[model samples]
Target chain A: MRERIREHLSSEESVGLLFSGCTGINDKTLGARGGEVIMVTSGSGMGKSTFVRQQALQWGTAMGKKVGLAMLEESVEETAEDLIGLHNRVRLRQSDSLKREIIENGKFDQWFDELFGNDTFHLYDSFAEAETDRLLAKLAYMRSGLGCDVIILDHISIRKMIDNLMTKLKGFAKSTGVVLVVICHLKDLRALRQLSDTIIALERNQLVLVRILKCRFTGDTGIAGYMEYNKETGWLEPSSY
Target chain B: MRERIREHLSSEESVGLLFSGCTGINDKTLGARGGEVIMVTSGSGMGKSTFVRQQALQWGTAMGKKVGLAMLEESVEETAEDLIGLHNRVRLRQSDSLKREIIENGKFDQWFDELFGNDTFHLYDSFAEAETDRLLAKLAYMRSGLGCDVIILDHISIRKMIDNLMTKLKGFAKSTGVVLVVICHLKDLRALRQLSDTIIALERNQLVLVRILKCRFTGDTGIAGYMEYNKETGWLEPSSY
Candidate 1:
């Protein structure tokens, strides 16, 4: 852990955090240097979940970093299906017929076993039972017990859902040195929004556009991009711009 | 001319505008379609000229589009040297010893002749004398006189410089069927800003980040990307996060 920081902070190459082609933000290789909290804010129907999950896929599967996802906005089944679909490079929906077939004919047990065997992913089912305290505890477990280096939470809702949680989340990130990413919705503007290390907004149309609105590391980055998104299947890419 | 609208507007197949690897605002191939106008907004040191010129290189040299670059900011020598440098790809700058040497011992006549002979770039240099009326007259001449399919203005400047030219630019784009793009600095805000087909912002640090702030064709697009730039030499690109 400390070693990664050493290499990343004082580096002269891809000796640390290698991003071959898996930067969700752009065609560039951007990394979550442990203890950073990134908040993705957008409006409704903007495919926030799709973008967040895609980011998780990049960090966890592509970069070979242990990742933890705690999604409370959508059903747990859909979240599981997405993770599985992304891993297999297929569209696995959360309907009964599709779910049954995923297990029946496509018995990818061997494939799943190999991936899980390597300690690739950890999850906290933040269903309706997403007690904030429990969510934190589970995140702590993922970091300490399961050795997850990144954590992503869906729609950290609005201010009501995470006004208080933000402080603790920042602390947990700094203390545990885990990259914490939370998805949020924008209903109004206020000063409280600036409590993040980075704030990115994604908008989708024929092309999905990603913009970095704020970053603690740098000053003034109001840039935007056109990215491609799978319209029917709901998959997105930075380079697909 | 009318045929392009047919493929882009009607049906869905690879029939519509294809973004192979260019996006004026992002990493993908996005463009100011003929008869469309795009405005790029940023501050002084945000690499606006570098960006506008790069697009010209892609269109004029790479894709064989008849590109016109009108600079009200720098000298004609600098712009000519840049295009020559990009064509020959031999680090050509306009200051110091290497500036004159580019034309002297470099034998760049062949390089310069080849690029210019292929119906490449037209220029609009407004060194210390960039009145709006003259600029419009020149743009008018480029589209009809020189048969330029596209025209790039170095700046659309604030308030009195261009608040009205945008309307004429749009009229020129639609009526004459020429692609028009202008560089703007976001010094003020108003509803009149939405006149163009697309609006983008460029931000720079160690690298340049391009962001698509507005696009009329898409429902939403707020994507941003990291682009490689030579901070020392002042170069931007179709690359980044």
Candidate 2:
């Protein structure tokens, strides 16, 4: 207890940020420390990927840390298009007659600007099987060679390799002092909970609530509040409601 | 698709029922087969054990099937007392002077009677480790010697033993032709979801909602509806509310 107090009073530069914006998905209390594993799990079509994409943007710009994205479900360009749409507050398709007419007629403002192409963000061009030796190599390259501070792996690519890869990933985070966020489906909660230092759960309902199921750092586990999926921007934004 | 009508017409007796009375859990749509896996997961203090105990009672009496309980987190004596409370509809406490007098005067009903001690209900006296060899032997003995066809295991005893145990249990159910129900925490949702023929989740917020997260048998994967926890009987009961 005395040593705990002394450590708390010591001067140490803080670690990286977990979530970027607080439009209320995360209520400023939940976070992932350097050298810790955090998992976000939800049902299908619950915006699990969208939530993390927005976080990658925030972690890059707001927190000023290099972020790496390893995407298997969607490519980097398509995901960037979402952040860009969100930035311009305009739908990429422009399917609405009024919006399409105005845009095609050159009345719309800067429609194709790349909103998430900042220097701090890095997207892995290709992904390999999430085998331990292969996966650790890619992530280590991002941190050691590319100078990325945090990395997000969009759900595990190989379903059967969940057990072996999970154990290795936890060790990777701890040994390397990188904030590792892994996205997963609802079924993987048991394995994730055992390994991850933090666990965030999303319930995609009428008022989508993102909850902090467990966090070892802050010792806080509570609701982060409802978030919104905005059609106008084609992005998931922090909900005002 | 043409085989749909033919399959429905084929001579096949229904395999089994997982729950006796779902109150609002399944809405009469979600169920499991004799050789299928069924999992119920909920947050802590969500009445998971209590809910399944009522189902076990109903399976024995209402459905007239022999049941076995292999309790790891709780003991048989304690579990029996809860059923006794449900049977008598009296607080097992017997605290108040008025109730004590009524009980002492024999005015109260059979308070001490064993309501769950029917010939069909069997509680394994000694628990072997949930290792495949030992666990299978106990369950096989129940099926062969005691004629118990349904087994309820309170939890997956070993954290590291989840994967192997799940595969073996699935095979056990299929070979022995018995309904196996396992209780798990919400953190274990992912792994449980993959194997469970039906996955029912309970959220104990204001007005608890029990929903079917997945049901492979009936093609249902949504809300099961509202349920109630009855304090009068010290049980979680089926309710329309």
Candidate 3:
């Protein structure tokens, strides 16, 4: 046991992937780690999906991790467009005119091939998979079949069953050694707080504050950073709050 | 019991929606009815999705029944494009050239609005929802919340669990009073055959034959009809065997 501990310490293995915008969280919490469940929560329309999508993009593209996205609230097409648009720094879904331009100019296929052709990003082509067992089967396939390094399960619910779902998810992450990031609507974090390694909450009215409500990795919990929404680029940039 | 039987007989309610091209099955079986489960099985590449989509189109548009499509094997966009293309008698997914033209000519939006604008069709936007209990919850919502009269569960499998899934599906249909159509891949029909009120199987190699293997509604089972695939229009037209 002592020799194994010495080996682990000497190998210099740090935390996993880093958050792109929230540098403070990265510094304090030492970024996200593998075999850990990170919970992201926020109020309605406060950018839970967007935040996680940003992380997915970073992990898949920059960090070269095989990422699986199970976005239950949105369609595959919508998620595809979002990733493409985010990569290209343009919100294509909002502007039909731009979409037409891209199609006419023949940049859509080019951009799509460049961004997604590498087999880095895998999307769960279902809007909502509420059943825990079925969802776990798919997530397991994402890990075993697709060899996904990280999986994002966007927004879970149906109430009264959150505990069971959380328990199953925790077990899945631990057993499979895949980073499981889940999105939720400001729920009773008490349940999530127990199982999760890190919990980040987004509060947005006019400006947005990214809060590290709980951080087990560094044991540091506070306002991680402030971010301003860029409408044109569809990104959250660091700002002084 | 006799008075109820007399009332039921006196009422002018015949069998429900008729199959569009399989006139023989329509005649012998008297068509599908509400509160009954219909099972469609076929070997690979025998056009199970196409046949069911054809029925969904007929039911949703011509019959004006609010139809809920729980296609577990495909994306929502693929299904949407298919229905639109089917309505226009052109296969859009196969032809990117036509899709480009339609987008440029602005017919894509027009066709989408025209076909899907009436709210007659609701699609389940998940690729594979394998859990029976969670699937039932979604179907229940389709019946109660969306007021859908007909629901289609496209394909079921994973072996051993087929009986549980089939049994739950049978219960859902009987209790909800909605026409439930299911697709399967030529499994041991002993379980599905018992629960399903109607069973139709498709055989294809060079020519396709629609077989009525089991029909509880009319108890008339045999080779129903022959169909020829139209490449240009993408329709299966009646033909001589």
Candidate 4:
């Protein structure tokens, strides 16, 4: 008890440089060991869940990293089924296989094999009964024990849950090394955009705001960039970039 | 020139009777089929897509009826992946012999073999690119050729296409013997409840409104009987009922 660990670092002469980085950079930077928190807030039905799912699948599969999705709006069973379906569809479309018969007769196992290979993922049904500490613990377990790198919280707004838990969750995410995505529902679209921008500015983080302000994100501020949702192709393609 | 096909009955009349026992006796009744257009309208993010997915899965597995989902918001790959994940999870939780390791290892083919035995249903990534005509054609093919009894349209909002398109699509649903469930975005949830009650009264159909105003066949009003969205169950179960 003669000298604590904190006293040693404080006595160092050049300690200022250690915290000299810009607040924006510090907020935005997901340090090598600290987890990143991405809050996605949007008006109802603006496709928040879909956007998160797409991002998670794209990032996880691309990097071959195990991803965990805690869906507070859908059951774990439903979430897993959706992921499996997405994995196969991405494979078939990537290979340019458009045969309806092949797709109609596609096997779930075959689809899972094609995308995830042999890697496993986790899905939590609800966070209502789960406390902040418990969720962070689960995330830590997934990263260390199950080898997961990305964790997606499907939604955070349920009654007064947001007011009670968001801050702690964000802090926990900063301490953990996992990439955390939190989906929040916005009351008004215009207010949502403004709030998002202000949050980004205040936090000084370089946030990728892929929001459907009107109908999907494209360009900075709304000059009609190249992002169009195509129903037939079953994918988003650059149409007016 | 010869007159176009104008019959004694309207298209809605043809499609509305697709359900069995709608008409008086077998002689007068057209005999309803499984596929009938059930429109689900609500404000954005009211859990429309997830609701449709839950309904489809329930019908496909529990009811042993073939169901197809046309995901307008997401890609076919993403949709398929989710379904597979859901199937595996349900099987694992419900079946004693369904091993967790098999699911974790991505041995979905074996899992599917044990859960479903064989491919009993289909899921199509028919995005919203297909016009009303094209969608009708696909619906007909699924019903007549593939024997799909239940067809779910993830959503169709006025923002994506013209308003007339929705009316025409509804008309087409009536013409075909397919059961259609179209998810719609309500401009105003409060106003929609009032309008839905009036419409339901005029049409003599069970409103079955489960969101903000769950107007079931019993004709209950107000938000007292509203259902809560359960993240774990992926259902809008009655909060107070």
Candidate 5:
């Protein structure tokens, strides 16, 4: 055990992928490393999806990480669109007339190929039948079959019915050495506190506040920073409170 | 008061915009009529944005109602992209490479013209400075200047500091006779129960559950229906539990 600890302390592979836009989060968490479960929660409609989407985009497109998305809350197509729109700085999802014109102008094929051409992203193809057991199996496949380095689970309801689901997920993430980012609603994360490596909560009232509730890696916890929702670009840009 | 009630009882204008997919919501609330407030709440990331986006699209495109969107959570561009993508049955926001290809193919202009050509939609231009007072003024402009019939407020924090904000909003909707749909997080909506004409809550466990906790129009409150998230099209289609 002493030798193993010493080896890991000196190893260069300890560092993980860094989050864009804020330095505070990156400074404290030391990035989201492998075998770590990062939990993101916020009030309803409080930019949780956008935050995760940004992270996934950066990891897949910029870092060239094999990112797998198991976003049960939204569709595969919607997830695809979010990345495309976010990358290009275009809000492609909000306009209906634009959608009609894209096909007529024959831009749909081009856009589809350009975004999906590299095969950097792998999405869970089903939504209606995302049972916990089925989802776990799929997640396993994403790591083993697809060899995804990082996996994002849009949400998992840690209720009485599936009490030990978090433990199972943590075990899977640890054993596979994959970075797992889980999204959840605002609730008591008493069980998650010990299991997860980091817990992030977004509080929105005056400005969108990014708080690091818990960070096991650095033992650092407090206000990370503030983010302002951008109206023009559809992004949460770093801002002052 | 008696004469006004009797007159409204027989009027066809009493019936308002109907929600698509589920008939229960429409039947119980008799649709969202003018001068009425509709509150939509749910657990975090439980499809609140998608639901309201659908309503805005249907009202603007199919119903020919001039729609105004004051989505505080996201950028104006994102709101536009959502409507466009939903209208086209394409998830354009998720793919970054696709966005680049769209511009390279010169399809961006065509799509933009097609979606915004008719001026069917109006959006709030700013985000960082969205004070309650400022927001109310802009909403008024949307009604008086831009002639928007329906307005969507992504959220309003009805805490101690802004307690009267809801009352003011209710007053604006009533006096202007415009349909107002507000998106909120789950909380004790006891105050909202009286102020709002309809209250819809989305509870996701086994399946995405839709519950109408309050409906003043029909005085009916119960489970409206269930919706399954469609992966192919990024839509919430009506489903059986």
Candidate 6:
């Protein structure tokens, strides 16, 4: 059965591949295919968490895609509140006619219920409690049972998430055809030279380094492009083509 | 005319004093007669700008005080949009009854107009363009012309706002007695010892070396209590007594 599933995933007619084609194109046409690990790294206070939260919600509700966010830093309540606040802000800014349905209903419960019932969005607050195994297990359950199309791990840092856990997770993502996103933090370095040395080491590890590591994604390893985090607008803009 | 004006200002029968009395308890209690200068300083990406904006709006609209914001970083259009966005958020979270009002009648505009007139709130892109004399002219105009009760300079950073602006502005604030608030940025210091040295030097300038500065009429300074900037709630919360 496992072999059959693997064959199906690798096949041109795979449902997972079709789903990836549909939902992975962010506003900029960038795609995150199934069974691929995408990393997002940024300096401290660079609005990484906000970017992830906004993306997850936009994908799940607005774009009609199933998404999951595994947040390891803040509590579930905190994350949920932030999402709701964003929703409220968006709704308010929307045209009166466009937002009539949401306004009349009052509150985001209808939207939340519709999306959650469809199993399109799920937020899990690991809150430092989730290990690599636990995260993988949750992802497996969501993908296989709940039909989750997108998985966002709030971060790839934290001691437990780094070591061998990242390697195993990357492998799982690639094999299972899960569209995985991992947020990372840049390590403090003495200078740009030191940062370059660290990047060389990271490249040697076959890691998919994201732009947040420095300014741009050099593509030295598996990095495809860069996402510019705009602090003023609270947006993650894909680098200009 | 000067004696008559002095008599009216000194007398308890003055409407200006009554107006001031009904505003902030701290300001009223301290008999904060002159303009206030509040400098909100934090590290980059600490949400200082957002905090100041929200506080100014809340004090102006909710508390029924006239407020003006001089934004250095963002355009006037962007600042207005942000204010409107924040106002909508506040209305949504606070009162459900206004949901219809917000949709049918453009609640934000109507409410904003009623509480704080569009003309009362002003934005200056920079001190260079606005200039010291011009800003003072505007402040006087806002006070005598528009009846503004509070004036907030979005920030006073050494990097962007330039040096001596704060000193010049502080002196002007003292002279005008317009409740002045200046948002500031902290200098980067390597160690606690370095920070202490900086603070000592700052104290010599006769300015209270509060980590985050807050000045009221009473002349109290140095860490005016803890204030938390909640991204989720989109509010700055004074530490609970």
Which structure among the candidates has the greatest lDDT? 3
lDDT tens digits, residue span A1-241, model 4: 4477679867743211111112222223222122445555555444455446665776566655677877766665445544554555432221213323333454543554565465656666655565767766776777777777777777755333454456556565556656666677644232222212112111101112232232111113322222333323323333432
What residue runs in model 5 are displaced by over 4 Å at the alpha carbon? Answer: A1-6, A125-127, A158-162, A187-190, B1-241
Model 4: docking quality category = incorrect
Candidate 6 structure, TM-score to reference = 0.40
Tens digit of per-residue lDDT, candidate 6, span A30-84: 2344665655555555555666666676777766778877787777766665666
For residue A195, give model 1's deviation from the true position in Å.
44
Off by over 4 Å in 4: A1-34, A90-106, A126-130, A158-160, A188-226, B1-241
The CAPRI quality class of candidate 6 comes to: incorrect
Candidate 1 contains a number of clashing pairs equal to 22
Best to worst by TM-score, what's the order? 5, 3, 2, 1, 6, 4
Q: How many clashes show up in model 5?
A: 26
TM-score of chain A of each: 0.78, 0.78, 0.93, 0.61, 0.90, 0.60
Shift of residue B171 alpha carbon in model 4, Å: 27
Which parts of model 1 are misplaced by more than 4 Å?
A: A1-241, B1-29, B127-131, B159-161, B187-192, B231-234, B238-241
Best by TM-score: 5
Write model 5 residue lDDT over B98-166, tens digit each, in one string.
Answer: 678877998777877787889788888564564677888888899999999999988654453245667
* Tens digits of lDDT, candidate 2, B40-149: 77877887777777788778867788888887666777666566655556556544664567567874454443444458788864454545668878888887888887
Better of 1 and 4 by DockQ: 4
Worst 10 residues of 2 chain B by lDDT: B1-10
Candidate 2 collision pairs: A187-B190, A187-B191, A188-B190, A189-B190, A190-B188, B23-B238
- TM agreement with the true structure for every prediction: 0.46, 0.46, 0.50, 0.39, 0.53, 0.40
> What is candidate 1's lDDT per residue for A1-241, written digit by digit as tens?
8998898878733222332222444323144556778788876556677777776777777787888877676544446556656666665431234445545564444445544556777766645674678778878988999888888877565654476688778889889988888888774252235567777777655365677777666444654455666533546754643
Candidate 1 at residue B154, lDDT? Answer: 77
> Looking at candidate 1, what is the lDDT of residue A122?
73
Ranked candidates (lDDT, high to low): 3, 5, 2, 1, 6, 4
Model 4: DockQ against the native? 0.02
lDDT of 3 by residue, B1-241 (tens): 2232223223423467888866577765668888889988887678888888888899999988999998777788988989999999999988989999999999999999999888899988674745767888999999999999889988764354787888888998998889999988763233676688888888887557988877664545568888877888777778777
